[PDB]
Design an enzyme around this catalytic site. Structure first.
Site, mmCIF file in Angstrom:
data_model
loop_
_atom_site.group_PDB
_atom_site.id
_atom_site.type_symbol
_atom_site.label_atom_id
_atom_site.label_comp_id
_atom_site.label_asym_id
_atom_site.label_seq_id
_atom_site.Cartn_x
_atom_site.Cartn_y
_atom_site.Cartn_z
ATOM 1 N N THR A 264 22.499 -73.841 -15.301
ATOM 2 C CA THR A 264 23.238 -73.930 -14.044
ATOM 3 C C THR A 264 23.109 -75.334 -13.517
ATOM 4 O O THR A 264 22.218 -76.081 -13.926
ATOM 5 C CB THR A 264 22.671 -72.971 -13.005
ATOM 6 N N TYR B 98 6.676 -65.413 -8.178
ATOM 7 C CA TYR B 98 7.956 -65.022 -8.792
ATOM 8 C C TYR B 98 7.693 -63.858 -9.777
ATOM 9 O O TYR B 98 8.395 -62.852 -9.735
ATOM 10 C CB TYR B 98 8.549 -66.213 -9.528
ATOM 11 N N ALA C 102 19.472 -62.392 2.091
ATOM 12 C CA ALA C 102 19.086 -61.044 1.622
ATOM 13 C C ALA C 102 17.797 -60.561 2.288
ATOM 14 O O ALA C 102 17.575 -59.356 2.303
ATOM 15 C CB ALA C 102 18.923 -61.061 0.130
#
Lengths: 250, 250, 250, 250
Positions: B191, B154, B62
């Site tokens: 996850t 972040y 990206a």
């Protein structure tokens, strides 16, 4: 079938946003009780959506504390245990804080704040610990986020619902009650009441108010409430869901 | 059929949240391109959901600006005009602001912030004015609302995505582009990456972190993204959708 | 001299935060009336700060609507036109929403919400259009931003004060009343009441509650209120001022 | 004497808000280094406030990473250990997200975001654990809270500063560094730059933009920064201080 097996109470469900919530809840498989103050409006509203196996009207003022346990009993007698409460009944007063009479202040808060308290408190008590995937959806507003100079008591009520709902969410989460509590914050929505106020829709549609240049429709609020009632939103609690055409983004 | 006729790009769609978004988008009738850096991971991911009439993998970082127009071209060649962009690719650095190297700062912001910018800018240009009901869904985080002492870069990236998305929402609304832009703010989600970090799920599941006492699953984020991609959310723009188990409510 | 010529009413000014506000207001040149329910507490409090040329006690319950115009009259007779209102009186109930009795709900909201309404409404009426640089400071809390599972009615009250204050700010701004309205949001503050609750300060000082690892002191709230009462803050209105040791930042 | 013994760096201190911060910091007893890109502007600015015992100019671009440790060294050589960092340098681009070139995006973020990162990271390292009552004040904006369709990159930068600052606040609090970090969010402020843009002040003064009907002045931001630099605000960290004439309240 997104609300398969759900049983919902929608207060103020006979008009506007509440009616559209009820309509889409039935479409997705819920059984629904709608409340309102006026029998002819409520009976017409219920039958416009479906028969009494899926939707019924109960006449009830959300400020009527004693009527709330009877409303749960009537709903459970019809459809079995309640899973979903939408606290949508509300009124508005067009006054600044400066110009609000104490009577107006108390009347609006009795419906908009005490009524939401009564439904939230009772909903937690009656739905906890039953494995229902229960969900309480409290109707705040864009007026729970931003002031409006001509809606002083209404702002107080919507700010209160916003943060009270977080308290309830947290207590339910921490105690593993299997109850979620969230708020929905509509912007301006076209209804017959808005249509009755000359110039209101155009004022609300100015870009300095709603950046989309038009106001919403009741189904816009119905679909976020379907998400929140469904098990799709099982990790969402204590949060604010804004559907406002960009009003609060500027 | 909630996404009948939609054509979506989901960046970082080969793992975790992005993969579940892709899965439920296909389930609801969308055609989807998922991106990721690693061909074996991406090819396996795409085929786990369906065949190439509904889902394809494109290898893309990206942060790779030149690859973004080619990603739109590849998607349109396969499925017709893109309607939906989910900017979900991201990386994380476990450093305080004090301890962040400039290399770490620039690397994380190149993916998490520049990548979202590239997808949002291109999405507006390529989807405006086509009657598509187009929707850009930018993945922020609970770290777009609250600090974390060990996630300084972040946090910067997620705060930037949060407010940049409002700018884009407003411009699209004011110009009647028929493009909506919203942010999704996951809390902690289980996850395979979380499972690889010993003790992470238990830390995240403490009540002082997530009041529900457990973390979420990828489908929890998929279903809010289905709502936002669908025409059900046609009045929602410039808003933040939090699915966090109560994290930000306390 | 930061409050040279100001004349302030501080409700709940005989204890804790309110007393420290009064103390620093007098230090900066204001004349102050402090209110409280208990004459011995109030008389001692006033004389601890200064003589009756700068500070006086008036016995008043902020829920007592008829007493509010008389409180303004008493203050103006002593010191001349009121410029500054600090709505700080409040009570707390340690109950979840589920466990709140209707009596507890109504009692807390009568002080925390109706009392702030009464002081804000009257303050606007009595201070507008006089060139006073008038300022209304409404005491919310961190509980106006985040839920607490054991403070349901208190959260409702503080959320209401938060957003009602914005309505009042806006109306005053739009009408050029020369009145500003803002909210102050203390975190945990050490007072004799906190000292009387065994274990409260240590609970509040855990890093998962207050990241600074300790709670504040009354002067921490006094100094933000001096800023807001002073002409230094002439461009600040409708805003929230948080002094909480980092509580709401995580 | 509210900043007795403080030693401050104010980036972008030679113009507008930064200059007024510097002016009032000196008035309250601080020693100040102001930075800017242009020597003639900076030297004039410093001497307009005072002599080199209280204020000095250092030519520095906040995007110049290597110059930041030398800026601290120059300041400490002049005045002793730095206690206070005001990250105020910034630039603006008038482009929507759609219309932002990648060059414009990178140029603005290098000053507005990387520069704040560099000053915050270095400030924590150089001021922690010294008993200084150290304070980092990061200049966000109303554009850190709400979008503006014509300020896409600027919104990204201000949203990033908003939340990155919370991370830094928390880490400093949790580690007992004796460093606070907060953000200041000016609304529209009259400066010579605003005066050079024909029609800007009148646009900004419309009631739909600033409800007070006029824009602010640099001292309006200076006085909130004095509060935040002073030990008066020793319990304030991780918070947002909005001085905007009501812009964000509606």
């Amino acid at each position: 079938a997104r609300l398969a097996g759900k049983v919902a109470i929608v207060t103020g469900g006979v008009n506007g946003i509440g009616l559209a919530i009820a309509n889409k809840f039935v479409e997705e498989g819920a059984n629904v009780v709608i409340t309102g103050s006026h029998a002819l409006v409520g009976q017409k509203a219920a039958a416009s959506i479906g028969g009494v196996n899926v939707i019924r009207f109960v006449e009830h003022n959300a400020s009527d504390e004693a009527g709330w346990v009877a409303l749960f009993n009537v709903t459970s007698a019809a459809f079995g245990p309640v899973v979903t409460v939408v606290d949508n009944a509300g009124i508005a007063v067009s006054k600044s804080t400066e110009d609000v009479t104490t009577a107006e202040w108390k009347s609006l808060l009795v419906v908009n704040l005490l009524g939401v308290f009564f439904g939230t408190r009772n909903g937690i008590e009656r739905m906890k610990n039953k494995g229902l995937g229960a969900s309480i959806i409290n109707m705040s507003t864009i007026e729970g986020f931003t002031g409006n100079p001509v809606l002083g008591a209404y702002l107080a009520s919507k700010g209160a619902v916003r943060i009270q709902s977080k308290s309830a969410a947290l207590d339910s989460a921490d105690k593993n009650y299997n109850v979620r509590v969230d708020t929905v914050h509509p912007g301006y929505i076209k209804t017959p009441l808005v249509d009755k106020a000359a110039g209101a829709e155009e004022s609300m549609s100015q870009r300095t108010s709603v950046p989309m240049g038009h106001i919403g429709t009741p189904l816009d609020i119905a679909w976020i409430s379907v998400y929140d009632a469904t098990d799709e939103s099982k990790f969402a609690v204590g949060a604010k869901f804004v559907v406002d055409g960009g009003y609060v983004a500027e």
